[PDB]
C-alpha cells in the first residue's frame, strides 16, 4: 500500500539533519544490540534475513537470506570475506550515495552484523572513486568506530574479529558487477567472470566471498533489531520491507525518500518527491528501476505499483528503484539513445554479444533519432536486442537490451513517424 | 589506446613516489591479504596521479615495480578505467554529467555554458591549462540532476549561471563553496520533507528481546 511512518523508517539521518558522525548515530542508537546479535551467532542472523524476506536491494533482488546463506557452509581453510559494493553506477541512483555520505555508521554495523552472519574475516567497501568526498566521510566514521572498539579485534565486546576497509573505484559502471567488483578488488582489469565458479565458491583471492548492495548490508542490523516480522510486514508478499525510492527527472521535487515497497507508482511521485512536471497528464514514460530496466508508458504506470513482483508482471524491473520520469517534452528516441551511448562508453568488451551488439544498437539508435533509418530497421533492432539479452557473460548486455525493447514495445508508432519525417523532406 | 613515446610523455620523465607517498603506498598494500600486493594497483596508480596528474608511461612503470606486477597489468588497468588521465590534465578538470537523468533536467545547457565560458570546446583544455572540459557520464548525484564534477568536488543542482559564477570563483581565488548551490539540502524533497519530518528514534526502540 504505502505511507510508511517516519518512525518506522530506517535511515533517520537521510537528508542529513542529524550528525552523520557517531554521536548523532548514538542518539540514533544504531549500535545498540550489536554485541548481542553477533553473540547470537551466524545462523540466527541469517535466519532473520530469511524471515525478513529481504530481497537484493541492489540490482537483481535475489533473496538476500539465501544468498548470504550460501557462504554459511564450513570454512575450507580459506578466510571468508565480505564485499559491500557501493559503486552506485546505475544511472539514476543516488540511493546509496545517501547512506554512505549521510549515515556511514549504519553501514559499518551493517558490515559486522552481516559479517558474523557469513563468518567473514573482513569486509572491503568499494565506493566509486568518483565519490572522493564520500570516501572521506566513511573512513572518518570507520576510524571512529574502531577507536570505540566497535569494530576490529574484540569487536563491540565480541570475540568476533572483523576489519572493515574502503577500496577506491575508478569510474566504471561495470566495476559494480558482482564478479567484476572482485577483480577490481583483486587488482586486475574490471572484467566479470562466468557464474559456474560461483562467487562464494571462488572468492576474492580464492577465498569465499559475498557481495551486497550497501542498502542490503545497512538494513540487516536494524532488521535484526526490529525483527524480521516488523520488516517483512511492510512489503507485499514476496516483495517485502521498505525500499528507498529515488525519483529524478520531470518531477516537481526530485528526492530520495524511503517508502513501503509495493507503493503505487502514480502515488510515489504524488505523495513524496513531487508532482509530475506539467501535471500527471504530462507523463510520456517512466523507467522504474533506472536505465537497465525497461521504461513503462503512462497508461500502465499508476495501475502498477513499485514492488519487484508487480514490475516483473509489468515486464519491467524494480532494480535500484530509481524513478526517471519523462514528460511529453522529451525525445525518447534520443533519451534511450544516450543510455545506449551510456553502455557503449562503458561495457568491458570481454564478451562478443555485448561488445559489437551494444555498439551496433548505438549506431542504429543514432540513425533512429535522426530518422534516417527506414521503418523495417526498427524490428531488426528488436532481433539484435534479444541476441544480446540471453547470450551475454554478465547482465549489462541484459540491461542494454531492455530499454531498446521498451522503446519498440510502447513507442513503435513515434519512431516510425521519425522514420517518415526524414523520408518526406528528402 | 597506444602510447607512441613522445619527449614529454615517455620514461625520460623520471617518476618516483615522494618519500611520504611511499609510506602511503605501504599502508595500501597492508589492507590487502599478504601475498596479494598486486591488488593494490588501482589504489597506488591513483596515488601516482595525485602526485602527477599526467600519470605518464613512466609512472605506470613505477607502479608496476612498486607492486612487483607485470608492466602490462598496470597498463591494462590504466587504459581500462577512466578516472586515470594518461595525459596532461587541467588544474581544475571540470567534468559535466550528460547521462539521460541530467540531460532530462537540461544538462546540455550547462555544457554549452561552459564551452564558451571556458572558451574551450569539450575534449579540450584552456590555453593556461587551468580548465579541462570533459563530457563524463553518470557521476552519481543524479537527484541533483544538473551537476558537474570539478576536480574532486561535486558541484550539484546548478543552473547555467551558477557555474559561470563557480568558474569565476575558480578563475580568481579558490575553494568556491563546492556542493549543491541551491537551497535544497542534499537530496531532500526540494519543497519540503515528504517524510523524516519528525525527530529521529531512540536506542532500543521496538527491539525484539535480545
Amino acid at each position: 500500500f504505502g505511507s510508511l511512518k517516519d518512525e518506522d523508517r530506517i535511515f533517520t539521518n537521510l537528508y542529513g539533519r542529524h550528525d552523520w558522525r557517531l554521536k548523532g548515530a548514538l542518539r540514533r542508537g544504531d549500535w545498540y544490540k550489536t554485541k548481542e546479535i553477533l553473540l547470537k551467532g551466524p545462523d540466527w542472523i541469517l535466519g532473520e534475513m530469511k524471515t525478513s524476506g529481504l530481497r537484493g536491494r541492489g540490482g537483481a533482488g535475489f533473496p538476500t537470506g539465501l544468498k548470504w546463506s550460501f557462504m554459511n557452509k564450513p570454512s575450507d581453510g580459506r578466510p571468508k570475506y565480505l564485499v559491500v559494493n557501493a559503486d552506485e553506477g546505475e544511472p539514476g541512483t543516488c540511493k546509496d550515495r545517501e547512506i554512505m555520505r549521510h549515515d556511514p555508521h549504519k553501514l559499518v554495523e551493517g558490515c559486522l552484523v552481516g559479517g558474523r552472519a557469513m563468518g567473514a574475516r573482513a569486509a572491503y567497501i568499494y565506493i566509486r572513486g568518483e565519490f572522493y568526498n564520500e570516501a572521506s566521510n566513511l573512513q572518518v566514521a570507520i576510524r571512529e568506530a574502531y577507536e570505540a572498539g566497535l569494530i576490529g579485534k574484540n569487536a563491540c565486546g565480541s570475540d568476533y574479529d572483523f576489519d572493515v576497509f574502503v577500496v577506491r573505484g575508478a569510474g566504471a559502471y561495470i566495476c559494480g558487477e558482482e564478479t567484476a567488483l572482485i577483480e577490481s578488488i583483486e587488482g586486475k582489469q574490471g572484467k566479470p567472470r562466468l557464474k559456474p565458479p560461483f562467487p562464494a565458491d571462488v572468492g576474492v583471492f580464492g577465498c569465499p566471498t559475498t557481495v551486497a548492495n550497501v542498502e542490503t548490508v545497512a538494513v540487516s542490523p536494524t532488521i535484526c533489531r526490529r525483527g524480521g516480522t516488523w520488516f517483512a510486514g511492510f512489503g507485499r508478499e514476496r516483495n517485502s520491507g521498505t525500499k528507498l525510492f529515488n525519483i529524478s527527472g520531470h518531477v516537481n521535487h526530485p528526492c530520495t525518500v524511503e517508502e513501503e515497497m509495493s507503493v503505487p507508482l502514480k502515488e510515489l511521485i504524488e505523495k513524496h518527491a513531487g508532482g509530475v512536471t506539467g501535471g500527471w497528464d504530462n507523463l510520456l514514460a517512466v523507467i522504474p528501476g533506472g536505465s537497465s530496466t525497461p521504461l513503462i508508458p503512462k497508461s500502465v504506470c499508476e495501475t502498477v505499483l513499485m514492488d519487484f513482483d508487480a514490475l516483473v508482471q509489468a515486464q519491467t524491473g524494480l532494480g535500484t528503484a530509481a524513478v526517471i520520469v519523462m514528460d511529453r517534452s522529451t525525445d525518447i528516441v534520443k533519451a534511450i539513445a544516450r543510455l545506449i551511448e551510456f553502455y557503449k562508453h562503458e561495457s568491458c568488451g570481454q564478451c562478443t554479444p555485448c561488445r559489437e551488439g551494444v555498439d551496433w544498437m548505438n549506431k542504429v539508435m543514432a540513425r533512429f533519432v535522426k530518422g534516417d533509418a527506414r521503418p523495417a530497421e526498427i524490428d531488426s533492432l528488436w532481433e539484435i536486442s534479444k541476441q544480446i539479452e540471453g547470450h551475454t557473460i554478465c547482465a549489462l548486455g541484459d540491461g542494454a537490451a531492455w530499454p531498446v525493447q521498451g522503446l519498440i514495445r510502447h513507442f513503435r508508432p513515434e519512431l516510425e513517424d521519425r522514420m517518415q519525417r526524414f523520408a518526406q523532406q528528402h | 589506446f597506444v602510447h607512441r613515446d613522445t619527449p614529454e610523455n615517455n620514461p625520460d620523465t623520471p617518476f618516483d613516489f615522494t618519500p611520504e607517498n611511499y609510506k602511503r603506498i605501504e599502508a595500501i598494500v597492508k589492507n590487502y591479504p599478504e601475498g596479494h600486493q598486486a591488488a593494490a594497483v588501482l589504489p597506488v596508480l591513483d596515488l601516482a596521479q595525485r602526485q602527477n596528474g599526467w600519470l605518464p608511461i613512466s609512472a605506470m612503470n613505477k607502479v608496476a615495480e612498486v607492486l612487483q606486477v607485470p608492466p602490462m597489468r598496470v597498463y591494462e588497468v590504466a587504459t581500462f578505467y577512466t578516472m586515470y588521465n594518461r595525459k596532461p590534465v587541467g588544474k581544475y578538470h571540470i567534468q559535466v554529467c550528460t547521462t539521460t537523468p541530467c540531460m532530462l533536467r537540461d544538462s546540455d545547457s550547462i555544457l554549452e555554458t561552459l564551452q564558451r565560458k571556458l572558451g574551450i570546446k569539450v575534449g579540450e583544455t584552456t590555453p593556461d591549462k587551468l580548465f579541462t572540459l570533459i563530457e563524463v557520464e553518470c557521476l552519481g548525484a543524479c537527484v541533483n540532476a544538473p551537476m558537474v564534477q570539478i576536480n574532486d568536488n561535486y558541484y550539484e543542482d546548478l543552473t547555467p549561471k551558477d557555474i559561470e559564477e563557480i568558474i569565476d570563483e575558480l578563475k580568481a581565488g579558490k575553494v568556491p563553496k563546492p556542493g549543491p548551490r541551491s537551497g535544497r539540502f542534499c537530496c531532500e524533497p526540494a519543497g519540503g520533507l515528504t517524510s523524516l519530518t519528525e525527530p529521529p528514534k531512540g536506542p532500543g526502540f521496538g527491539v525484539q528481546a535480545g
Binding site: 578466510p79 574475516r121 573482513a122 572522493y132 568526498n133 570516501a135 572521506s136 573512513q139 572518518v140 570507520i142 576510524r143 574502531y146 577507536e147 576490529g152 579485534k153 574479529d161 572483523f162 576489519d163 576497509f165 574502503v166 577506491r168 | 609510506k23 602511503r24 605501504e26 599502508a27 595500501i28 597492508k30 589492507n31 591479504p33 599478504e34 589504489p43 596515488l47 595525485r50 574532486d152 575553494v175
Partner: peptide, 22 residues
C-alpha cells in the same frame, strides 16, 4: 573541504587499528 591524500593518509592512520593480515 578535504585534501587529495585524505583517503590514503586517513587510511594509514587506521592501519594501526587494522587487524592483523591473513
Amino acid at each position: 573541504d578535504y585534501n587529495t591524500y585524505t583517503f590514503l593518509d586517513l587510511n594509514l592512520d587506521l592501519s594501526k587499528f587494522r587487524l592483523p593480515q591473513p
